[PDB]
């Protein structure tokens, strides 16, 4: 709820994303939702988080992914690559 509130309200957005990654680490569907959120948004700490997520990475999850789009792993990898590129540019 706090994360959603922060989202509704740049640094705040980053803090929310960090909180989300932390929650995902503590916990498949959740991970997918997180990836979707990251893609929509599209430094060192952020990269570390993205990495941990990649390391962590069924039918219900696929359905959720399909609903969001309206392959997933590939899109996730692409997003991660983009983030890495952004970090390198910074």
């Amino acid at each position: 709820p706090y994360a959603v509130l922060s989202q509704f309200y740049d640094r705040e957005d980053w803090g929310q994303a960090l909180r989300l990654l932390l929650l995902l680490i503590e916990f498949h569907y959740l991970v997918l939702l997180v990836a979707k959120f990251l893609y929509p948004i599209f430094e060192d700490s952020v990269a570390t988080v993205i990495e941990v997520i990649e390391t962590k990475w069924s039918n219900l999850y696929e359905t959720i992914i399909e609903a969001d789009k309206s392959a997933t792993l590939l899109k996730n990898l692409r997003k991660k690559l983009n983030f890495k590129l952004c970090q390198a540019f910074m």
Partner: peptide, 8 residues
């Protein structure tokens, strides 16, 4: 408090 329980 709420943000300390989320970090845990």
């Amino acid at each position: 408090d709420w943000v300390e329980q989320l970090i845990l």
